[PDB]
Amino acid sequence: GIQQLLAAEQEAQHIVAAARNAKMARLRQAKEEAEREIAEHRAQVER
Amino acid sequence: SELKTTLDAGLLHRGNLLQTIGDQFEQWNLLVKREKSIYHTLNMLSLDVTKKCLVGEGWSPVFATKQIQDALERAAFDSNSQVGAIFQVLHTKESPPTYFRTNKFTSAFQEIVDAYGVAKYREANPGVFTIVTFPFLFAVMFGDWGHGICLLLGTLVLIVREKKLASQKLDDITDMTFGGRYVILMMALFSIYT
Amino acid sequence: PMQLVQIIIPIESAHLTVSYLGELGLLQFKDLNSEKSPFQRTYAAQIKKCAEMARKLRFFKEQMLKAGILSDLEVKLGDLEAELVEINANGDKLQRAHSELVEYKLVLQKA
Amino acid sequence: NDADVSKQIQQMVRFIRQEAEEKANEISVSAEEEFNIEKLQLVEAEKKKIRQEYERK
Amino acid sequence: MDHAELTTEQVLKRDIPWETYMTTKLISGTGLQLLRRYDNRSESHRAQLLDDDGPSYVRVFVSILRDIYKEETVEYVLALIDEMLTANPKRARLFHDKSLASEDTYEPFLRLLWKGNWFIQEKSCKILASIVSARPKPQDRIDDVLKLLVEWLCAQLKKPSHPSRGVPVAINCLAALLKEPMVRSSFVQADGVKLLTPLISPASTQQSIQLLYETCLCVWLLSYYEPAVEYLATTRTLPRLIDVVKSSTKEKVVRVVVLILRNLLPKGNFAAQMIDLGLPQVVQSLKAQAWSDEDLLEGLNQLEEGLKDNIKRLSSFDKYKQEVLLGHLDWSPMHKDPLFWRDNITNFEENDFQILRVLLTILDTSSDPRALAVACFDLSQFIQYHPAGRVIVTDLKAKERVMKLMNHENTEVTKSALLCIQRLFLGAKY
Known part of the structure; x- marks a missing residue:
């Protein structure tokens, strides 16, 4: 009952915590990802 | 004269608006009563964010709980919610207050008898015997078969006019007397027999 | 022979469930959350807003009764009360202007 | 049991689906797109400087 | 799915x-x-x-x-x-x-x-x-x-x-x-x-x-x-x-609606939303009904706070500065509008409409001849609104400037001058 209902709640809370962590990662990974793309554009111009 | 005419027109418009405003407020009174009841339930009963629902426990008649909880769950389901309300039972060592079901005529005698107190959920109810015992004893103190007829006739008019009486208000003593019309009639019949 | 009943009414239909229960009425309300006062509590802040709306509606009804009237909803009632108050104020101002002009007319006629 | 165990799972299912699948998924996805646009703008400034650089050369 | x-x-x-x-x-x-x-x-x-x-x-x-x-x-x-x-x-x-x-x-x-x-x-x-x-x-x-x-x-x-x-x-x-x-x-x-x-x-x-x-x-x-x-x-x-969204039972649906609305706020867009659609009042009700995550409710309040910031920008104080601190009088959309003058009357009072008295002195003596014509427009509006101001304007050198403008070439200056005279005049005799 109450314990059974608590299992669903903690699970939803964990999913939201994962979503929060993932958001920070998407922004951070992006800064490295297109820094190389900018260099590739510079290379295309150099060629 | 122009200012008086303008004031009269404004007052007439205000009265015309208030004619429908009062009609709306008639139902708004019941709406506010329902809102106050919901507010009292919210402030008195807690809720679980984890359950995302209002939860709690309270006393309810078993016969009533046989259908009332199911009806509430069905209404909640019909309210377009993802799931209806629960109907689970609860147990505790505390003894909840309870009241025996009151009939249309037995209500007055039951209320008169209950002025001494209450009992357990299904404990002794002296009202059952006293509903006739009090007429069976008060008759002796006023036994005269020329006045009991008058008392019954006076009670009879109250019973007949009950349809209009239930709507129109009356004096506080008159209202208290009209509240026990059936009991008065029974006592008058017993007095006539006595 | 009553007994305890424990249930959960989802927030998606908590108000609807409460209204349906109050249509007939079977179980008395509990008192667990009452210790938190009208200050927030479970929904006492919402209860506070509902009480303010009810007070506005009561003021409107009292004004209508004083006017001899015959007896989103809260917002509409407040708007109607404001309109009636404005109409009454306009009528009072016009009556005062009429009284002042009548007094001036009487004084000028006597002069 | 019976109605109780039925309602308990139903409320739990609603909690898991709405609070997490419907909302948590949206939180991660919406933030990612906003971040993707933010990085692209940061890259554009470097590209403009590089474009200004090739023209100067 | x-x-x-x-x-x-x-x-x-x-x-x-x-x-x-x-x-x-x-x-x-x-x-x-x-x-x-x-x-x-x-x-x-x-x-x-x-x-x-x-x-x-x-x-x-x-x-x-x-x-x-x-x-x-x-x-x-x-x-x-x-x-x-x-x-x-x-x-x-x-x-x-x-x-x-x-x-x-x-x-x-x-x-x-x-x-x-x-x-x-x-x-x-x-x-x-x-x-x-x-x-x-x-x-x-x-x-x-x-x-x-x-x-x-x-x-x-x-x-x-x-x-x-x-x-x-x-x-x-x-x-x-x-x-x-x-x-x-x-x-x-x-x-x-x-x-x-x-x-x-x-x-x-x-x-x-x-x-x-x-x-x-x-x-x-x-x-x-x-x-x-x-x-x-x-x-x-x-x-x-x-x-x-105002009538939405689901908190998430309202929060989702707010995100888009949160991103579309502009000085123009805030104006359209506030005036016509009465966004802030619905937003205030949503802020009052805090639901689910506090941060989600705070974001709605922040969107309302952002709209309020646009409202300050909307209520620009540049017009008053342009007339006196800049010293250049140009017509603009709010100087031919009555509403602005009504809110500006109170701001002038510092020693009997001291800002207005300095403006009356500016009307009497101005660096640009063109400025006098818009100045007369500006004065007219305050006097009509303030009957006491109209009588003061006739006493003020602004009326003397208006008299010179009445005896002056340029049709537009004479129109504005005539409107100034009439504004004082309506109030002197009742």
């Missing part, structure tokens, strides 16, 4: 014996055998037949699709390609051949908008469309992208046949593509945004919530791309979506 499953069921239930069709000539034999082998690929998984998870079964399916015009075979095949692509159990090798070579992704564009419009979407639609555009960026085998948008418009026209599927597939594909800004531009060309806006504005029930999310997830994508946002700003029901 549930919408995709209902379609995907209709196709995989009905069986199609390719080999018989081939013998009758509608395809050559290699194709029918190849499609039968693709169905056996799930069975071989069990038997460890690494060849079932092949890519080499792919080639005939590509061939078969373009050549055939018989809807039954290409639909049954498309479903089986679709199911394979996303699965990690089976049809891993499948995804490789497509991804390496843009030629299959051009063959996919011929397959797109082919067969029954309902049949093609149920079989695959968004499942393989997105990746094909990624594999071939042009996706013109974007004239082909425009043809795909026309096919989406045709699916929208048949909203009744598959609302919980055909519309859902289009919404999911648009959201998946809108992740890339160029693919969002393709979505901007595609129509049906207004239909989603009408669906967003009014919710039938939980059933509306099923695509509710997607329709406005696209609105979040539209917030990302300004061009789609301009079309959305023109599109109606944006205000209606806010009105539903």
Whole structure:
């Protein structure tokens, strides 16, 4: 009952915590990802 | 004269608006009563964010709980919610207050008898015997078969006019007397027999 | 022979469930959350807003009764009360202007 | 049991689906797109400087 | 999702014996055998037949699709390609051949908008469309992208046949593509945004919530791309979506509506929303009804706080400074408007309209002859509004300047001067 209902709640809370962590990662990974793309554009111009 | 005419027109418009405003407020009174009841339930009963629902426990008649909880769950389901309300039972060592079901005529005698107190959920109810015992004893103190007829006739008019009486208000003593019309009639019949 | 009943009414239909229960009425309300006062509590802040709306509606009804009237909803009632108050104020101002002009007319006629 | 165990799972299912699948998924996805646009703008400034650089050369 | 499953069921239930069709000539034999082998690929998984998870079964399916015009075979095949692509159990090798070579992704564009419009979407639609555009960026085998948008418009026209599927597939594909800004531009060309806006504005029930999310997830994508946002700003029901948000029971739906609204706030846009649509009052009610995450409620309050910041910008104090500190009097939209003067009367009072007295001195002596004409306009408005000010203006040197202006050339200066005289005059005698 109450314990059974608590299992669903903690699970939803964990999913939201994962979503929060993932958001920070998407922004951070992006800064490295297109820094190389900018260099590739510079290379295309150099060629 | 122009200012008086303008004031009269404004007052007439205000009265015309208030004619429908009062009609709306008639139902708004019941709406506010329902809102106050919901507010009292919210402030008195807690809720679980984890359950995302209002939860709690309270006393309810078993016969009533046989259908009332199911009806509430069905209404909640019909309210377009993802799931209806629960109907689970609860147990505790505390003894909840309870009241025996009151009939249309037995209500007055039951209320008169209950002025001494209450009992357990299904404990002794002296009202059952006293509903006739009090007429069976008060008759002796006023036994005269020329006045009991008058008392019954006076009670009879109250019973007949009950349809209009239930709507129109009356004096506080008159209202208290009209509240026990059936009991008065029974006592008058017993007095006539006595 | 009553007994305890424990249930959960989802927030998606908590108000609807409460209204349906109050249509007939079977179980008395509990008192667990009452210790938190009208200050927030479970929904006492919402209860506070509902009480303010009810007070506005009561003021409107009292004004209508004083006017001899015959007896989103809260917002509409407040708007109607404001309109009636404005109409009454306009009528009072016009009556005062009429009284002042009548007094001036009487004084000028006597002069 | 019976109605109780039925309602308990139903409320739990609603909690898991709405609070997490419907909302948590949206939180991660919406933030990612906003971040993707933010990085692209940061890259554009470097590209403009590089474009200004090739023209100067 | 549930919408995709209902379609995907209709196709995989009905069986199609390719080999018989081939013998009758509608395809050559290699194709029918190849499609039968693709169905056996799930069975071989069990038997460890690494060849079932092949890519080499792919080639005939590509061939078969373009050549055939018989809807039954290409639909049954498309479903089986679709199911394979996303699965990690089976049809891993499948995804490789497509991804390496843009030629299959051009063959996919011929397959797109082919067969029954309902049949093609149920079989695959968004499942393989997105990746094909990624594999071939042009996706013109974007004239082909425009043809795909026309096919989406045709699916929208048949909203009744598959609302919980055909519309859902289009919404999911648009959201998946809108992740890339160029693919969002393709979505901007595609129509049906207004239909989603009408669906967003009014919710039938939980059933509306099923695509509710997607329709406005696209609105979040539209917030990302300004061009789609301009079309959305023109599109109606944006205000209606806010009105539903006021009546929305679900906290998440209101929070989702706020995000888009949060991103679209501008000095102009805040003005339209506040004046006409009465956004702040609904926003104040939403702020009062805090629900779910406090941060989500705080974001709504921050959006309201941002609108209030726009309101300060809207109430610019530059006009008062331009008249005195700059010393240049030009007509502008609020100096020919009565409302501004009504709020400016009180600000002047510092020693009997001391700012107005300095302005009256500026009217009496001004660096520019042109300024005197607009100055007379400005004075007139305050005096009409303030009867006591009008009598003071006649006493003030501004009336002396008006008398000189009355005895002066230039029609516009004389008009304004005459209006100034009359303003003082109405008040002197009652």
